[PDB]
Structures are given as structure tokens and as C-alpha cells.
């Protein structure tokens, strides 16, 4: 209920329909900025953040108390400020804005481990954190084949699945 559906297909290209009917994307062929406070009157669909493991995040009064509108109020936001999470919350986030663009955030880049420099769902080049809206945010990764992997973030053993070309 706390997901923000402010979607708007003003070019009639068909993306917003893909949110509801998956796997129908037409291939034919085909860094991140610091997280923060995003106006939910901008985001379309589930917002995800990656620990690297993925988790949906909800709307919120800037005071921090969760706000249960559907991005309706401008007093309704996604609070996303992150810290690299052995200790913190999540490496980075990704979502779709109102006119259909994939947006992402994360901690600042930089021996080049995910635990030290990871800024979202990207991990290594080619391998990407799989999640039930990957084909929607990163659609060109439809050929990517999805292996079971495990990673350690400063000692913690994590099980997840990575889509890779």
C-alpha cells in the first residue's frame, strides 16, 4: 500500500504496461549519485535497495514516520540516505521515475571490492543483483543468465542470485 504509483506514459512507448505484464519487453538491441530524499510524487513502482540482497522501501514523512499514501502527498517521500552496510542500511537503490526512467543511487566509489566500493545493485560488471523488477529497471539485461552466488560483507555470509551476461 505504501508503494508510490505516479506513472505517466506521455510518449506511449509502453513501459508502464511492462510493470504489470512482465517478460514482454522488446530487445532489438540496447558513477551513481549519492542517495537522499526523493519526492514520492516522482517515483513509479516498487523502490528497491540492495544490501546487496534486495528489499523494497516505502513512503515516509520527512520526520521519518512512515506515510501510507501512494506518493500522493508531497509530505510523502522515500528516505534513502545510505551508509555502506556491514554496519549501515544498503549499498544503493534503484527505481523508475514518472516518465519512465530508471534512477539509481548509492555510496561514493573509489582492492575494488563490493564491500568497500559498492554503490547499488551492480556488484561486478556483467553480474547484477537479481530481483523481481530487474527486467523492468534494467531491461536490456534480459539475456543475462542468473547464477546462485554468495558474498561476504565484512564477515556476514549472504545468499543471493546474480544475473550475468
Amino acid at each position, epitope marked *: 500500500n505504501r508503494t508510490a504509483l505516479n506513472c505517466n506514459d506521455s510518449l506511449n512507448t509502453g513501459w508502464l504496461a511492462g510493470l504489470f505484464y512482465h517478460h514482454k519487453f522488446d530487445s532489438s538491441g540496447c558513477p551513481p549519485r549519492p542517495c537522499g530524499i526523493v519526492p514520492a510524487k516522482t517515483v513509479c513502482g516498487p523502490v528497491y535497495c540492495f544490501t546487496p540482497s534486495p528489499v523494497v522501501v516505502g513512503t515516509t514523512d520527512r520526520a521519518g514516520a512512515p506515510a501510507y499514501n501512494w506518493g500522493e502527498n508531497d509530505t510523502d517521500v522515500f528516505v534513502l540516505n545510505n551508509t555502506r*552496510p556491514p554496519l549501515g542500511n544498503w549499498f544503493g537503490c534503484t527505481w523508475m521515475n514518472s516518465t519512465g526512467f530508471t534512477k539509481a543511487c548509492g555510496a561514493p566509489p573509489c582492492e575494488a571490492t563490493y564491500s568497500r566500493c559498492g554503490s547499488g545493485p551492480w556488484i561486478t560488471p556483467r553480474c547484477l543483483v537479481d530481483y523481481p523488477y530487474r527486467l523492468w529497471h534494467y531491461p536490456c539485461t534480459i539475456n543475462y543468465t542468473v547464477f546462485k552466488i554468495r558474498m561476504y560483507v565484512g564477515g556476514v555470509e549472504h545468499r543471493l542470485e546474480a544475473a550475468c551476461n
Partner: antibody
Amino acid sequence: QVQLVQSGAEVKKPGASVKVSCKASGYIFTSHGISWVRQAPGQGLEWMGWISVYNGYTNYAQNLQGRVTMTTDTSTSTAYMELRSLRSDDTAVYFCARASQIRGVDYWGQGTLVTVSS
Amino acid sequence: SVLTQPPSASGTPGQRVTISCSGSSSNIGSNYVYWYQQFPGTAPKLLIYGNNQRPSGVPDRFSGSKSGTSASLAISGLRSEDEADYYCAAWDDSLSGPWVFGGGTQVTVLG
């Protein structure tokens, strides 16, 4: 600004469940993690563990033989440090502090002195 | 403990005293190193994060550096307002950590 208001100085003798609270404000409590460092008087600082407000990840220190139990309640923005089965050495000022992976443990509460003696 | 620094330091009005913190590969080697100021009967006040990065409040005066398994700070211009203890810390990727501190260095002025 960001601060951390620790609770008062409890005092009790050996074998005791202290539990100093540590109230956070001025940042997104869940964004960072927080730790604890005690300082028995005169000598230096002793890192004592840290916790995720978000994961629940806890790396307690080896010295404290599983006595510690850091714990938070995202509802109230309070963080806690229970330490059971107390003993003389445990007489120290017990601070909490925010902890980022890049900015270290950076902003510290005021202090909680806690004394054990017969 | 786990890290080591001289137990004291001395200085005169504006004599840029030095101070040293020394560990291994498992701490000072691959990780960042932070430095704290402790005035008696107060919580420690973080002075430098990363290795050379200073936060708000901290004057242009306090600065630092790192080389190999040695990280060392200079207090630059001296006002006795600086007379304090000074503790260093880094991460430690090993079991020796993941976080280690120094023994501190109380610093007095010669005046």
C-alpha cells in the same frame, strides 16, 4: 545537529544486569550503525562491539565473553547495551557512538559511568 | 592493546608537535585511520576521518597523514587549548578487529 543522549549512571555490585540506553537524533537513525566504547578511569578506550540499526548485524568483542547484548528499537530511536554478570573491571564510562564505514565511529554520546563494587 | 603511540608529547607556543600510531597490514595497511581528541571527563571528539579528512568545527590547524603501517598527525599552531589526550583508531579486516584503538597520547605544553 546530531547528538546522542545516553541515560544516567546506574550503579550496582558484581553479577548485575546493567543496561545503559542511548537516544539518537539529528540524522537518520537507521542510516548509520552505532557501537560502544568503555573507558575504565585513567586508562584508554576499549572498543566493545557495534550493531546495525538496520541489519541487526552485531560484532561483539572477544574480551567480553558473550556478556554483551547491543540492541536497538527503531520505533523510539533508542539503542541499548545490556552487560550481564558484572565484575570489578567493568567500572568505566560507557559511551555509544554513531558508526559509518567511512567516517568511523564519529559522534559520541556524553557518557555513562557505571560502577561495580562490593 | 592493539595499537601503540608515545605516552606523551611536549610543545611550545606554535611548535607543530608530532605524534605517531603504528599497526600492521591488518589495520593501517589497507584501511582508513581516524584520530580523536579527549578532554578529561568528556566523550571523545572525532578529529580526522578517512586518513586526511577533517569534519566541521575542526580548524585548518589539525591535519594528518599516513605512510605504510604508520599514521601520524601534526597539531600545527599551538594554543594550550589543545592540551589533551589524543587517540588513534583504524579498522582491522582480521579477527584482531574489526576495530582497534590506541593507548592515547596526553600532550602538554612546555610554557
